[PDB]
Structure 1
Amino acid sequence: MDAKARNCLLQHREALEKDIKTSYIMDHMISDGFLTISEEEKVRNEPTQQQRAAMLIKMILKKDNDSYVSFYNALLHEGYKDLAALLHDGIP
């Protein structure tokens, strides 16, 4: 993804990981088409909520612009408008 978007995720990494429950966000991104079911299972396998969110963010950091926007939209739609507001200015 564009550096602007990546740097924004890094800036806000700790809050994102602190706060996010992954299950609904991930099904949103899978329905959208920008997270695979194999990626989802890797996240789901982690044994705590912080560790699942850490895995998800780790994955997203390696994806493209279209995936950043899908993640952003999932935050907007699945109960994290606060976190979406932090990532808005980083949209590719």
Structure 2
Amino acid sequence: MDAKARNCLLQHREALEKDIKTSYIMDHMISDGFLTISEEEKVRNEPTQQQRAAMLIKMILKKDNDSYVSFYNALLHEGYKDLAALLHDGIP
């Protein structure tokens, strides 16, 4: 993704990992076509909620602009309003 978007995600990574549940967010991204079942399974293999969130974000940082926007939308749809707001800045 564009460095601006990547940097925005890196900036708010800690906040995201501390709050988000990955299960439903990933369902949305898979539905959108920006996360594979292979990736979902790897995320799921992480022991804790935060470790799963860390792994998911680690994968997203290497994806494209559309993936960033998909992540943003997933956050909104799951009610993480403030967290999505933090990333709004990086939307290309």
TM-score over 0.5 for the pair: yes
How many residue pairs were aligned? 92
Aligned residues: CA RMSD: 0.6
SS at match of 1:90: coil
| TM-score for both structures, normalised by structure 1 | 0.98
Identity %: 100
| TM-score for both structures, normalised by structure 2 | 0.98
| In 2, Cα distance between equivalents of 1:78 and 1:11 | 21
Is there any run of 5+ residues in structure 2 with no aligned partner, and where?
none
TM-fit CA distance, 1:81: 1.1
Is there any run of 5+ residues in structure 1 with no aligned partner, and where?
none
Q: What whole-Å deviation, never above 9, does each CA across 1:41-75 have from its counterpart, x for those lacking one?
A: 00001010010000000000010001000000000
| In 2, Cα distance between equivalents of 1:58 and 1:42 | 11
TM-fit CA distance, 1:79: 1.7
